[PDB]
Amino acid sequence: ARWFPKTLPCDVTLDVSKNHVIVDCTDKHLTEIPGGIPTNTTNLTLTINHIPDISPASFHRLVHLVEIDFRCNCVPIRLGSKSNMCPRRLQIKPRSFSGLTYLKSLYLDGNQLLEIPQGLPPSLQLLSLEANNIFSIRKEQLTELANIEILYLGQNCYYRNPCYVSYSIEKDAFLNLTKLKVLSLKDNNVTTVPTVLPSTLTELYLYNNMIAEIQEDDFNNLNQLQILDLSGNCPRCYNAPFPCTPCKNNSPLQIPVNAFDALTELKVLRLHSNSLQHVPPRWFKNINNLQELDLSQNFLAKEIGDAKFLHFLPNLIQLDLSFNFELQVYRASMNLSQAFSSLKSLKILRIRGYVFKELKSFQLSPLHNLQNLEVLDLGTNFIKIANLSMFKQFKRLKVIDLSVNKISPVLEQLYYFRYDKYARSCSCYKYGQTLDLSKNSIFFIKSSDFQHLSFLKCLNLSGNLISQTLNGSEFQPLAELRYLDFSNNRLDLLHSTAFEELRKLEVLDISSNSHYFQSEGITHMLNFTKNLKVLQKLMMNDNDISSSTSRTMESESLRTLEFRGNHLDVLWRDGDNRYLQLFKNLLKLEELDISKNSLSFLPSGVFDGMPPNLKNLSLAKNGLKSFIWEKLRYLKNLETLDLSHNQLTTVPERLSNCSRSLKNLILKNNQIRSLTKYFLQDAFQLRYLDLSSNKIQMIQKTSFPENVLNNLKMLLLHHNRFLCTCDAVWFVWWVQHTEVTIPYLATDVTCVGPGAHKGQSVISLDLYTCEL
Amino acid sequence: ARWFPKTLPCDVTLDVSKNHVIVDCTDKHLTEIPGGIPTNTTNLTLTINHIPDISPASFHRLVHLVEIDFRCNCVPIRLGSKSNMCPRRLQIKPRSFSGLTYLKSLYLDGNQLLEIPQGLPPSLQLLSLEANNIFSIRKEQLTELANIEILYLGQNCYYRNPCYVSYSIEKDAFLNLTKLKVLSLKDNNVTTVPTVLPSTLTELYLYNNMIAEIQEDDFNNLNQLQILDLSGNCPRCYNAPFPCTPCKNNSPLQIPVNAFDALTELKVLRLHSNSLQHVPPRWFKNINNLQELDLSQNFLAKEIGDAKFLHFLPNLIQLDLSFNFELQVYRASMNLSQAFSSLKSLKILRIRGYVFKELKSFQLSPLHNLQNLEVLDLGTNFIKIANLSMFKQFKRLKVIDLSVNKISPVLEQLYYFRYDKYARSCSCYKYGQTLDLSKNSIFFIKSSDFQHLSFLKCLNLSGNLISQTLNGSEFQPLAELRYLDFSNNRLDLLHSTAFEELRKLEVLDISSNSHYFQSEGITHMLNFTKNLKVLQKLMMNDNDISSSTSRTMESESLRTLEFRGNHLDVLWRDGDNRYLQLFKNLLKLEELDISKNSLSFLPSGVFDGMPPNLKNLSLAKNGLKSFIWEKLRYLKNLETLDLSHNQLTTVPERLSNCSRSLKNLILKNNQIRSLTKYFLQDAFQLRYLDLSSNKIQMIQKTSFPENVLNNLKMLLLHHNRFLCTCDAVWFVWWVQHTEVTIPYLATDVTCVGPGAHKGQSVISLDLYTCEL
RNA sequence: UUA
């Protein structure tokens, strides 16, 4: 169909709307800019390659470029690969960019540059030089950037990329940049706010530096500033997972009371990890628009009990006061000031790491009439006691987070403790009201524990110690609960009445409850599903289930069952017929995951035993060594079959003769060495075929008829063992001239032989010598 | 060194003392008996091959054979591989064995034989025919076995290898076998004890059959019997993990009261899973020598409270009454009869699965004066309450087992519930008194819990719910404890005083206590080791440790640290020097396991950071992509280095220049494609080198000097990519003629090329054309 | 590949 094969090792996209020709060569092991890049190219990405230099030749023809992304072709030693250390810094020749009249964005982050590159065109709006070795900014080097709006200069001097001196910025270096909106100088070992800065700034990032003092006029002319981040100047260093040097005598960052007086437009103020002991009300006198305030990782425990400054923040949406506890103190109570009640617009309040023994209803009374409050995060507080009934006065909330506490009768895993959570690289909430009790010490539960919480839509009990024989009495008040996460407990399914009181339960997660399934002679009633009349989804992954008192699971409602990481190999021991119908009476089941069940083979009766509307079956990662393909005829509604990461060596003689319904066949990471002669013949239903990471040498036309290939949304063939002899003439031609989407066609569809052509892409292969 | 290359694909051993020539061809993918088996061969093993027949040709020359092991060359469909099903049963021609005048043992198990093979020589003492299809035994077929002493006929008719009829044994079929000592007819669907049996029997195995009734004279003449097993006739089938058919009418196996009167010599009586409700004293009237009695999986709950039969068993060493509970009953107490106190010789008492709520001191009073009691096993009883101080009256015991209970304030994983625990295939006790509390519901511990248990040498708390901040007050009474297993709990290392009260602790296991290490901003005091002055071995595997409040671990005593499955990659993040000395002050440390820590590289300073006496270092399974071999020079006492399952592509230019001490280098499962020119030159200290499962093409003599190779105890080279051209002449010759042990030389040391020689063993490779 |  295609007249000219695409040989270029980069993804090319067209967006004729926004008038872009997008060439993405991210991570293609390039040592040169590839030849033959389209002349109409507008966005060119060469991130993560080993191109040692740029010159006038680099972009000679590419005069329509609006964006070059040339990040991480020489990333600093400590940040980059140790197995492929860049030997010498990126070399930028004179006149390399001055021809690109239309260039609006240039990313040269992570190239070990020593200086701000010169001869940039006046069209440039965005320049990024993060993770280089530029630690002295001179006015003279910045004249070329007259029209610049966004300037990223961070991560040029810090523990992962040191310069061993203080950062230098000439007086007024940036003042003549009259269009500058965003300046980032984070993670740079800066000692003072550089002045004077242009009044056109909207965003100023000065975090993770060595600034001990703010002068009262440092921010004087910045009447357009919207975002200010001064975090990590005078850090709180307790349990820091990076090298952390506080200011002497554990002094706070010193901020005059009138330092923010000009910032009428400020929306975000971040003062994380500044060792603050006091938040003076006077700070917020002329900021009436402040929406987000981060005061996490300070020493504001006392202040939280007083907090007069809150009276000046009626427009605040987000407040973060996490990790303000006094070292070596375990308070009895949380003392929230009445001033919290003036936070009229507050949607989100986080106070992790206050560290207190007992949470009581009254302590939260300042929050009672906050009409817009949506999230209350009291995680990581080592709370031992809480009457959960107190949250009956918080029905309007979307999330109550008591995660990581010590109670007994979505932010990243590292968040409050990472160095730079905004650093650039080279869930049941949607069901309604959520009470997150994950990672507590709840060993026993009873109905009264949930009195007055009938409004709850999701309860998270993951990672507790719950070991009891649930009999259906434990959750009686939770009449509206749609989602229970009971993973990482110690469920004992002695009673088939477990969970039946949750009459509106749609999703049950009982994954990683393997404990009692690990000892012989214990009763397990897997038939507990019968009572849950609206259950849609059941997850029982990683339970190590190798035995069951009940022979069948039953549901009229269940659509999805995850049964990964169990021992169906033992339940279906060849010769034992008793569990061959375990899932058959799940009448509405469409999706079954029985990956990771050590099924090295499937006994006969398994497919017959499957429920009638099964659509999506995974048998991945089972060490399957054999498969009777014909048995797929019992799965009359099968559409998706995942057999990835097994040991299959052969495909069926005629797939169409095995299933009338099959659309998506995943066979990646198997041991397949050849395709059968008529493999895909008349498989009119097929739409997706993954044959990647096998050991295929040859594919002949008979296997791959064009009336089937041409309905495929995608065909994966990469990481095989293709033999590029004259025998392969058809496959080589076809691959070169097909419209069919085949990912990695240029990069990992490769000849392994013979000799001459070893390591060569088949897309690039010239076989004229087969045709003389 | 060797004059004639060993080409036979079997391991050949000499024991010139016992005059044996032992040829072991186990699992060598043979379809033929190999030619050239030594003529002096005495023991020939051909287990697990696909040899389709035996004939007079098979053993023509092998006239000194005393033992043929020809098991599992055609194992029944349900028992064998589904990816390589034996197509047709093993064919044994007339006259195949009649020439083997000296043959004493013939194993033909698992070959799908239909009949007992005839023409066996009169020398035969042992014949094994398990897992065949022989389910009718006729006197006529057994005349040839005049001299036979051991006959295994089991697993010829059961659920995994069905015959679909009752087993048939002719009247008196075995009587004329006047030397028969051991008869096994287990797992055979036998319906009556065959009679009459020879009086020379010492062992009779009739378990897992369909025998409903013992006739009073079935065992009349068996005055030499030592072992009788009638288990699994009328099985107790609750929660059975195999298909289990009880006798109708809930009947027990019916044994007349005088059935054992003749068995004066009986030592072992096994009546497991016979649905017994009563144990009549009259059974044991003329058995005064009985040492082992298994009454597990019956219905003897009531009987345990009475048990008059015990008065007749003063010589009994082992009593097992496990799994006798009445279905649907949860007793308050254990009612042990006073008759237990007459068990004068008892060393081992097991009563798992009695199922009761509360254990109290008095309930065990019948055991108080059993002077030789060594093991009391009360596991899997769902006990909720036990004052552990009761065991102060059991100081003399070696093991108190309360594993798998419900307490709160070595037998195989499947044992009582497996079909045939004696079926043939094709720990802290040694420290002294052990209290095993593993797999209970203990969420909190205090010193008083251990009052009066000062004698304990090992405590097992594995798999409890212990979540507390141990401050060193919790185990105060346990002044003699040498071994604490605290794995699979939720250790919170807030206090560096944790465990310090255990002044004699030699082994601490705190593995799989990952819970609190998974959440940011939690204090962990890894320096807690300092206070344990005699600690030899610390295991803290799978703790997911990625952060630590202390920078160094300290011990004067510690020899072995297991730190597998943690996040040293995070602790040693490039640029962070703070934890590079974490193990340095473990001054006597010899063994460090830091496998599975995602160390894709080692920062410089890690080797310098190692303690000075390190002998055995594992860096396995880290995804290591690079390794500065020269830095091994800091490890002046290094003997074993395990770098298995990594991504290394190169070896050092000269290993001797890296380490003077290194004896054992494990490099298996890496990506190594060639060896350096002088790799092993002058590395005379080397004794073990595993280079298996790499991608090596060539090895030249310069890399592999013979003055080093020859003193290797072992050299592993299998599963590489060897190219068998004239360039490989040296390696091929050396491999063919070396004394040095190289495993799998016959099976997986293979040429991948070129063309001709692909898939061929290098041992078998003829390279004469390289020498014309 | 008799569990």
Next chain:
RNA sequence: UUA
């Protein structure tokens, strides 16, 4: 391979 800026976290």
